Symmetry: C3
Subunit: 494 residues, 3 copies
C-alpha cells in the first residue's frame, strides 16, 4: 500500500525553553533576547572618547591641581571616567559647591577650551599667584590650583573687575572664598579684619561676607577655602568686587553643551581602544538586545535592566523525534532540509521531502516576531547622573526607588512576554503542520484511509507524479476514484 | 450540480496593519488607538476656565504689579496660562522665594479671592504706601505693588500686628524684605541702622535680620526687595514684629485648594472658546484614546505619551479578495452585508448570503476587544508641574529621566500590544470562517464532495429550503442519503 | 445504535470572568490574583518585630522625652510604628533637623544600643543636667531629655571635647542649640553674651553661632532649642568646641544598618501577635499574589499596587451545561454528569451508558493551567518595598515628584494587570476548546467511516460496540478493520432506507 505522511523537523539540539503552560520544553532552535556578557572594558561611546581623569577628582582636574594634567588644547568627551578613590582631589580643604549640578553640564561636551579670563597683574598693592604646601607640584613643593589665583595683602582695599563674554560659547568659571581661622591669621594673609567679595554673573548676585572661624585641622589647615562656580552665557558679563579673602577665577573654560547627559563612570580600569553604544562601570554593553542583567546604571543607547537569569525565545519546533509514522507520533530526524514536510512510500521507492514554501513562510513569521520584540525597544538616552548632595539622602532614595520601580516593571513584563510568546510559537508550528495535513486530507478524500498517525494509506497506486501532485495540491480525485473504489470493496469484505 | 460555499467579506479598503508575524497586511477595516491631532488651541479644562495672566508673570500678578490687572472679584481656574517671557514681571528687583512650591498650591483652585488683611493706618510715626519709579503705572509714574505696602521711617521703632484666620479657606500672604545698599541709604529710608522683621505663621517662625550690602544695579536699583510668602490655615494665626526694612502683606488671597495639581501652561496664544479633557501648551488633546504622541507634558485626563508614529488595531478581515470558489482562495467582494457567509448555486438560482449571527458575534467580540484596550486606560490626573529652583538641576534631571522611563515603558508596551492583538484578530477571523466551514461539512457528510476550495459539491438536488436548512444547521442527512448514494455510484465508476 | 460522545465538565459554580472578547462568562472555576483584604493588623515583618513608639514621636523617643520609655536593652526592629498624632513629642520647642534622612538610617536596624558617650563632669565652672517645666516627668514637675545634657553658665568659657568611635558599629548622636529670646535671658542662662558651638564629625564641620531673637510663645517658651544629629562611623572621630548655648550628646546610639529601608507606619492600632511579608498602615498584606488594591504605600515583600476592583483568572471551563434521554456532546455545551475530570466521554450501548473522564488529557491541562497561574504569580519577584517617601516642608515640589512617580507606576501596573487578565482568560477558554476538539478528532480518525458523525459532538457507531470496544476507542486502540465488514453492511441499510 502506497503511503504519504506529514511530519516535521527534529535534530540533536539539547536546548529547552519555558512557556506559560510548560517548563523545559526541548526545542530544535532558540534565541536569547537577554544581554549578559561581562567584558570589563571601558570604551568610547558611539565613537566619542571619554575624558580620563587619571588619578584626579573632577574638581581637582577642573581647578588645576598641580598634580593633575593641564588642558592644553580644545577637547570633547562623551562621558567622564574617574577613579573610585582619586589620589589627587581638593588639596586645600574646603567644600566644592553644587558638584552634582556641574556634572550635568560637563559630563558630555563638544568643545571644551581653557582660556585666561583675568589679567591678574592689573591689580596693585596686593600679592597674586600665592602658593601653599597643601597643594604641591610633587613631593614637598608648594604650589596652587593653576586656574584659581589666590590674591593676598588686600589690606581692606577694594579690587574691582569686570568681564564680558564676547564668544559664542558659555564660560565656566570657578572661584574660591577664604575662611580664616582667627584674627591673627586674617591679618597675616590680608593685613586687615575685612575681606568680603561680591561676584555678579548676569543678574545673579553672589555675596561672600568675611567669615573668621576655627575648624578642625585637615591637610595642615584649620582654615578653609570654599569653592563655587558659575556659567557666563554668550554676551553676558560678570563682575567682582573684593576687599580680601578671595581666590580669583583667572582661568575658565569655554564649552558647548550637548543634549544627552551621560555622567561619571567610576572605575580603576584604564580606557581601552574599543567602541560601544552603551557603557557601564563594570563593562561595555555593546548590544542591541532589548534587555540586560549586567548593571542598573549605564550610559548611551542601552537595553533595559532586568533581574532575569535568562530570556530565551523559542524559534524552532518541539524536539520530540519518533513504514514510518507521521507528525502525530513526533518529529523526523530524517527531515533535514526544512521545518515541515512529507515522507512517501510507493513501488518506485521512498524518501523525505521538505515543504519549502510552508517552511519559509513560517521562518519569515518567526523572524519577524523576534525582530519586532528586539527592534521595538527604541529607548531614550540612558544616563548615570544619579547623585545628590550629602544632605539630600531622601532624594537619592527617591532616585533609587524610581529605578527599583522600573526594574520590577521590565523584569516582570519581559519574563511574561517570553513565556507567552513561546507558548504561541509552539502552537504556531502545530498549526502549520496541521495545515499541510488538512491540505492533503481534503485532496485525497476517500481515495485514502487516514491511518491516524499523520499518514495516509492511498487506495490506489500512487507513483512519483501522483505523490508530487498531492504535495503540490494538484491531485485529481476523480482520476483515481474507480481504482480506489475497487480496492475499498476488497477491504469491506476481509 | 448544486453547490454551497463558505466565504468572507472583502472591500475596497487600502488600510493595512502590522502584526507580530507579518507587516503591512491589508484589512477591510481598522481602528487607531493613538491620538495625533495638533490643533494649537488652549481651552477650558473639563468646563473650567484657566487664569490668563495676559502679559504678566505669576508673581507680578499675585503681588499686584501696577501694570497688571487686579483681581476684582472672587474667581477660580483649572490651570494658569502665562506668556513664555512676560513683559510685566518683578518691577522692584529681588528674588521671589519658592515659586515652584507656590505653583503647586494655586495652579488649580476652586476659590480665589483678594481681601484686605491689614489696616496700615493703625501704625504711628511711620510712612506707608511708599512708591518707587521702578514700579510705575506707566512712563514717569512712581507706584508699587497693590498688595504689598512699603513702610518706611521706622526709626528702629517696633511695629506689632496679629491676625486670625476665622474663615474656612487658607490665606495666602506675600511680603517683602528690604536689603539696603549702604548705611546712608538705610538711613534715608528708615532713619536707623536697624530693621529686622519676624513673621510667625501658626507655629512657624521666620526671621529676617537687617542685611546691608551693595549689589549690581538693576532697573536703577543697587538695593533689593526680596519676596516671601506663607499660608495661614483656617483657624490659624499670623503675627508680625518689625523694626524696619519691611514690605507688609496689606492684601492677601483666601483660596480653596483642589486635589488635582495642574500647573502653568506657557504660551503666547490666547484662551479660545473651547473645552477639553486634556490640555498641552501646543494644543488640546480632546480624546479618550489610550495613547498620544503629541507632547510629553500635559494636564488633566490624558492618554499616555508614546513615541510611536502610529498604533492601528485590526478590526476587520484580511482584504485578500479572490463558478465561484470559497474562503480557501480569498474573500468575496460580493459579500456586502456581513463579515462571514455563504454563496449557493441551484436550479432556482444563486446568490450571496451573510451569516448574520456569526457576524454579529464577531462584531461584539472585536468591539469588546477595542473598547477594553481603550477604556482600561483609566489614568491618574496628569500634571505639568515639573519645575525646581535653579540650584536644583539634579532634581529636574531626576524628573526628566522619570518621564523618559515611563515614555519607554508605554511606547514599547503599546507597540507590542498592537502587534500581538493584530495577529490574534486575524486568526480570530480565520477561526470563525473555519467554524462555519466545519458546521456545513459535518451536516452534509458524504452527501457532498468537499471540493477543497471552501465549497461543497452536493450530490442531490438542494432547493432553497435545503440551502436554508444547511445555513441554519437543520439539514437532514438521511433525507437525501439515497439520492446522494446513487450519484456517488455513478462517480465511483464513471 | 451505539454512540460515543466527547464532552466536558460543568458544575453549579456561579463564578464569571471577563476576557478581551466577552464579559461575565460563567466558568466552572477561577483564581484571583488580586489581594483585597483589609485586616487593620500591625504585625512583625518577616519574623522581625517593629519598634512601637507607643504615644511618643520618633524625635521624642530618640532624645528621651521623660514621658517616653527609655531603651534599656539592645534591640532591633523591622519598621517603626508611630501614632498619627503622638501625645508626647518635642517638649522644649524647636525644629528637629533632617528627620526624613534620619528615618532612612534607623527605620530598619539589626542592633540598636544606647550608651553613655560623654562624662559631663569633665567640664568645670558650668552647670549640667539642667531642667525645664516644659519637659516634666509628671504634673508640675521639671525635667529634660534623658540623652541630651543641657549645660548652662558657660560665662563665655570654651569647653573642648574629642571622641573616637572604637566600636564596630556607627554611632548616632543628637544635640541641641539654644536660641535665647533676649540679652537678659542669655545672661540668666549663660552669664555672657557669647555662646557658639562648633561640632566636627570626621571631616565635616558644623558651626552654630550665637543667635539671640524673640519668637512666639510655644509651651510657655519664646526661646528655642533646635535639634541636630550626626553619625560617627567606626574609627571616626568627632569633637565639640562650645562657649555656650549648647545641649550636649551625653548619650548616643550604636546601631547596625540594614540594606532594606522600610519606614514609619502611622497608626493608632497596637502591634498584634502576627507575622506578615508585607505591611501597610491599614493592615497586613500577608500574600504572594502579584497585585493588591489595598494601599499605595507599604513595606516589605509586596504585591504591586493597582486600582483594579478585581483580577480573576479563568482556570476552569465555560460553565454552559446542556439542558434517560439521548445526550449530545461538546457542540451543545458541558456535562453536569462528567464529575471526575475536565474533558471526557459519554457512551451508550447494549450493556448500558455512562460518563468517563479522559484522565491523561485532564491532568495535562490541569498541569498547564497550574503552570500558567503560578507563572503569573511567581514572576512577580519584587524589589523590597519602602514607605519612606517624605521630604521637608520647604520641599513640596519634590514630594510632588514622589507622588507622580507613584501615580505613574500605578497607571502602568493597573493597565497591564487588567489587560493580562483579559488576554489570558480569552486564551484559557480557547485552550479548553482546543483540548476538547483534540479528543474529538482522535475519536473521529479512529472510527473513520465505521461511524456517522452526528454533528453534536457524538458518533453513531455503525456496528455493535460493547464496553471493550468503547474502552479501545477511549484508549486509542480501536481497530477499524475489525469492524469494517459489519459497518459497511449497516451503511447499506442506511443508503436505501
Ligand atoms: C557688559 O559690560 C559692558 C561694558 O561696560 C562696562 O564696563 C565695565 C568695565 C564697568 O565699568 C561697567 O560699569 C560698564 O558698564 C556694557 O557695555 C557698556 O554699556 C554702557 C551703558 O550701560 C555704555 O555706556 C555708554 O558709554 C558711552 C561712552 O563711551 C562709549 O563711546 C565712546 C565714544 O564717545 C567711546 O570712547 C567709549 O569707549 C565707549 O564706546 C556713552 O556715550 C553713553 O552715554 C549715553 O548713554 C545713554 C544712551 O542711551 C544715555 O542715558 C546717556 O545720556 C548717553 O547718551 C553710555 O554711557 C558703554 O559704552 C558700554 N561699554 C562698551 C565697551 O560697549 C554692556 O552693556 C550692554 O552693551 C552696551 C553696548 C549697551 O547696549 C547696554 O545697554 C547693554 O546692556 C554689558 N552687557 C550686558 C549684557 O550687561
Ligand atoms: C489666635 O489669636 C486669638 C486672639 O488672641 C490673640 O490676640 C492677639 C492680638 C495677640 O495679643 C495674642 O497674644 C492673643 O492671644 C486667640 O484667641 C485668644 O486666646 C487667648 C488665650 O490663648 C484668650 O485669652 C483669654 O482672654 C480671656 C478674656 O477675653 C475674653 O473676654 C472678654 C469679653 O469682653 C474679651 O476680652 C474677649 O473677647 C474674650 O471674650 C480671659 O478670660 C482668659 O483668662 C484665663 O484664660 C486662661 C485659662 O483658659 C489662662 O491662661 C488665663 O490666665 C486666665 O485664667 C484668657 O486670658 C483670648 O480671649 C482669645 N482671644 C479671643 C478674641 O478669643 C486664639 O487662641 C485660640 O482660641 C482661643 C479662644 C483659645 O481657645 C486658645 O486656647 C486658642 O489657642 C489664636 N488661635 C490659635 C490657634 O492660636
Ligand atoms: C545526532 O547524534 C548522533 C550521535 O549521537 C549522530 O549519529 C552519528 O553520526 C556519527 C558520524 O557523524 C557516527 O559516527 C560513526 O560511528 C561509528 C560506530 O557506530 C564509527 O565506526 C564511525 O567511525 C568511522 O567514521 C568516522 C567519520 O564518520 C571516522 O572519524 C572514523 O575514523 C571511522 O572511519 C563513525 O564515527 C555515528 O555512528 C552516528 N550514530 C548514529 C546512531 O547514527 C547524528 O548524525 C546526529 N545528527 C545530526 C544531524 O548531527
Ligand atoms: C582620632 O582620634 C584618635 C585617638 O587619639 C585621640 O584621643 C582623644 C581622647 C584626644 O586626646 C585626641 O587629642 C587624640 O588624638 C587619634 O589617634 C591619635 O593620633 C595622634 C596623632 O595624629 C596621636 O597624637 C595620638 O596619640 C593617637 N592616639 C592613638 C594611640 O590612637 C586619631 O589620629 C589618627 O588615627 C591614628 C590611627 C594615627 O595613625 C594618627 O596618626 C592619625 O592622625 C584621630 N583621627 C583624626 C584624624 O582626628
Ligand atoms: C542623544 O541620544 C538619543 C537617544 O534617544 C539619540 O537619538 C536617537 O538617534 C538615532 C538616530 O539619530 C535613532 O536610532 C533614535 O530613534 C534616536 N532617538 C530619538 C529619541 O530621537 C541621539 O542621536 C543622541 N545624540 C547624539 C549626538 O548622540
Ligand atoms: C481629579 O482628577 C481625577 C483623575 O484621576 C478625577 O478622578 C476621576 O474622575 C471620574 C469621576 O470623578 C472617574 O470616572 C475616574 O475613575 C476618577 N479617577 C479617580 C482615581 O478617582 C477627578 O474627577 C478629579 N477631581 C475633580 C473634582 O475634578
Ligand atoms: C531585603 O529585601 C530583599 C527584597 O528583594 C530580599 O531579597 C529577596 O530574598 C528572598 C529570600 O530572602 C528571595 O526570595 C528573593 O529572590 C530576594 N529578592 C531579590 C530580588 O534579591 C532580602 O532577602 C531582604 N533582606 C533581608 C535581611 O530580609
Ligand atoms: C560594538 O559593536 C560594533 C558593531 O557591531 C563593533 O564594531 C564593535 O567592535 C563592538 N565593540 C565591542 C566591545 O565588541
Ligand atoms: C472635546 O470632546 C467633546 C466630547 O467628545 C466634544 O463635544 C468637544 O467638541 C471637544 N472639544 C474640542 C476642543 O473640540
Ligand atoms: C433554524 O435552526 C434552528 C436551530 O438550529 C431550528 O430549531 C429552527 O427550526 C430552524 N428554522 C427553520 C425555519 O427551520
Ligand atoms: C447542582 O444542582 C443541584 C441543585 O440543588 C444539586 O441537586 C446537584 O447535586 C448539584 N450538583 C453538584 C455537583 O453538587
Ligand atoms: C502570613 O503567612 C504565613 C505563611 O502562610 C502564615 O503562617 C501566617 O499565619 C500569616 N499571617 C497572618 C497575618 O495571617
Ligand atoms: C504514474 O501515474 C500516472 C497516473 O496514472 C500515469 O499517468 C503515469 O504514466 C505514471 N508515470 C510513470 C513515469 O510511470
Ligand atoms: C424543496 O425540496 C424539498 C425536498 O424534496 C421539499 O421537501 C420541499 O418541499 C421543496 N421546497 C419547495 C419550495 O418546494
Ligand atoms: C465485546 O465485543 C468484542 C468485539 O468482538 C468481543 O471480542 C468481546 O468478547 C466482547 N466483550 C465481552 C467481554 O463480552
Ligand atoms: C533621553 C532623551 O533622549 C534623546 C535626547 O534628545 C533627549 O533630550 C533626552 O536626553
Ligand atoms: C493624580 C491623582 O488623581 C486623582 C486625585 O484624587 C489623586 O489625589 C491624584 O491627584
Ligand atoms: C529595594 C531593593 O531590594 C533589595 C535590596 O538588596 C536592594 O538594595 C534594595 O533595597
Amino acid at each position: 500500500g502506497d503511503q504519504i505522511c506529514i511530519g516535521y523537523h527534529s535534530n540533536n539540539s539539547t536546548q529547552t525553553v519555558n512557556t506559560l503552560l510548560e517548563s523545559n520544553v526541548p526545542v530544535t532552535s532558540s534565541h536569547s533576547i537577554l544581554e549578559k556578557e561581562h567584558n570589563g572594558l571601558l570604551c568610547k561611546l558611539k565613537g566619542k572618547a571619554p575624558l580620563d581623569l587619571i588619578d584626579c577628582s573632577l574638581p581637582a582636574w577642573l581647578m588645576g591641581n598641580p598634580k593633575c594634567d593641564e588642558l592644553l588644547t580644545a577637547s570633547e568627551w562623551a562621558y567622564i571616567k574617574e577613579d573610585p578613590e582619586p589620589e589627587n582631589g581638593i588639596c586645600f580643604p574646603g567644600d566644592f559647591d553644587s558638584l552634582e549640578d556641574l556634572i550635568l553640564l560637563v559630563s558630555n561636551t563638544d568643545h571644551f577650551r581653557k582660556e585666561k579670563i583675568i589679567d591678574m597683574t592689573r591689580f596693585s598693592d596686593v600679592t597674586t599667584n600665592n602658593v601653599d604646601s597643601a597643594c604641591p607640584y610633587d613631593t614637598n613643593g608648594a604650589s596652587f590650583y593653576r586656574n584659581l589665583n589666590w590674591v593676598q595683602q588686600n589690606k581692606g582695599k577694594q579690587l574691582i573687575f569686570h568681564y564680558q563674554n564676547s564668544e559664542n560659547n558659555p564660560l565656566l568659571i570657578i572661584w574660591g572664598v577664604h575662611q580664616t581661622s582667627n584674627a591673627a591669621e586674617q591679618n597675616t594673609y590680608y593685613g586687615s579684619q575685612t575681606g568680603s567679595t561680591t561676584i555678579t554673573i548676569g543678574e545673579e548676585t553672589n555675596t561672600y561676607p568675611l567669615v573668621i572661624s576655627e575648624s578642625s585641622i585637615l591637610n595642615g589647615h584649620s582654615d578653609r577655602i570654599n569653592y563655587f562656580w558659575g556659567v557666563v552665557n554668550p554676551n553676558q558679563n560678570f563682575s567682582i568686587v573684593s576687599t580680601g579673602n578671595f581666590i580669583w577665577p583667572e582661568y575658565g573654560y569655554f564649552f558647548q553643551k550637548t543634549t544627552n547627559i551621560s555622567g561619571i563612570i567610576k572605575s580603576s580600569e584604564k580606557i581601552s581602544d574599543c567602541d560601544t553604544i552603551c557603557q557601564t562601570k563594570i563593562g561595555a554593553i555593546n548590544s542591541t538586545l532589548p534587555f540586560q542583567n549586567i548593571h542598573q546604571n549605564a550610559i548611551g543607547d542601552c537595553p533595559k535592566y532586568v533581574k532575569a537569569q535568562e530570556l530565551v525565545l523559542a524559534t524552532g519546533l518541539r524536539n520530540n523525534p519518533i513504514a514510518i509514522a507521521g507528525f502525530i507520533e513526533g518529529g523526523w530526524q530524517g527531515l533535514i532540509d526544512g521545518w515541515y514536510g512529507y515522507h512517501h512510500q510507493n513501488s518506485e521507492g521512498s524518501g523525505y521531502a521538505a515543504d519549502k514554501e510552508a517552511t519559509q513562510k513560517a521562518v519569515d513569521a518567526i523572524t519577524t516576531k523576534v525582530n519586532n520584540i528586539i527592534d521595538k525597544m527604541n529607548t531614550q538616552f540612558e544616563s548615570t547622573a544619579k547623585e545628590f548632595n550629602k544632605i539630600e539622602m531622601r532624594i537619592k532614595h527617591l532616585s533609587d526607588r524610581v529605578d527599583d520601580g522600573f526594574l520590577d516593571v521590565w523584569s516582570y513584563n519581559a519574563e511574561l512576554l517570553v513565556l507567552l510568546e513561546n507558548e504561541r510559537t509552539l502552537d504556531f508550528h502545530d498549526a502549520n503542520v496541521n495545515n499541510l495535513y488538512q491540505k492533503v486530507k481534503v485532496q485525497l478524500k476517500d481515495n485514502a484511509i487516514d491511518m491516524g498517525n499523520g499518514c495516509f494509506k492511498i487506495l490506489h497506486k500512487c507513483n512519483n507524479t501522483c505523490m508530487d501532485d498531492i504535495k503540490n495540491g494538484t491531485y485529481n480525485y476523480y482520476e483515481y476514484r474507480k481504482e480506489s473504489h475497487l480496492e475499498k470493496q476488497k477491504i469491506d469484505s476481509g
